[PDB]
């Protein structure tokens, strides 16, 4: 049972700008997604300070980067607070409408796409490199859900029958054909060292057969 939703017009505009603007510095997508994971881990850590049972769904707080060249996917896994179904539908827990408004004003006023994270909509930088994005998520207060979009104005939400996650969020980037450098170990290491050196959680880059 799959529910299909329309993006708000402002978010559809944001994604089309990200997909269509000529902008070579695409590597910042990974910084933005790792930053989102760190924010989600901060949230469940804070909640656990007054209620230790919040970590009954998993005590480890970490970020995993999983490249798969056969599937041409890069997956970013975190054990943060996750998202409810309502969060997913509401622009994956962001204030994307007001954030997009501020971002596009800054772009005409000198800014570039790399500053997207300052406007709270860094998730959508995934479409710099991905033709399709799948988000699997589990929040303590809801069931496991799968969000998916290839842009084009719509996204889907369904209950996830796949591998149970415990708690957190999995962002699966189905990479564009010409963006497979982001599956190479040395390229991922370079980006993480350049942009994510002070993230306060272990980042593990998985290797392949
Ligand atoms: Br790939 C990769 C590259 C470098 C690190 C070093 N890290 C920085 C991120 C946060 N943990 C402290 C140490 C990790 C993964």
Curated annotation (Swiss-Prot):
Binding site for ATP: 36, 78, 97, 123
Modifications after synthesis and translation: ISGylated. S-nitrosylated; negatively regulates the ATPase activity and the activation of eNOS by HSP90AA1.
Locations listed in the record: Nucleus; Cytoplasm; Melanosome; Cell membrane
Disulfide cross-links: none
Residues that bear N6-acetyllysine: 43, 69
Subunit structure, as described in the record: Homodimer. Identified in NR3C1/GCR steroid receptor-chaperone complexes formed at least by NR3C1, HSP90AA1 and a variety of proteins containing TPR repeats such as FKBP4, FKBP5, PPID, PPP5C or STIP1. Forms a complex containing HSP90AA1, TSC1 and TSC2; TSC1 is required to recruit TCS2 to the complex. The closed form interacts (via the middle domain and TPR repeat-binding motif) with co-chaperone TSC1 (via C-terminus). Interacts with TOM34. Interacts with TERT; the interaction, together with PTGES3, is required for correct assembly and stabilization of the TERT holoenzyme complex.
Function per UniProt: Molecular chaperone that promotes the maturation, structural maintenance and proper regulation of specific target proteins involved for instance in cell cycle control and signal transduction. Undergoes a functional cycle that is linked to its ATPase activity which is essential for its chaperone activity. This cycle probably induces conformational changes in the client proteins, thereby causing their activation. Interacts dynamically with various co-chaperones that modulate its substrate recognition, ATPase cycle and chaperone function.
Listed name of the protein: Heat shock protein HSP 90-alpha
Biological classification of the source: Eukaryota, Metazoa, Chordata, Craniata, Vertebrata
Stretch of the intact protein here: 16 to 224 of 732
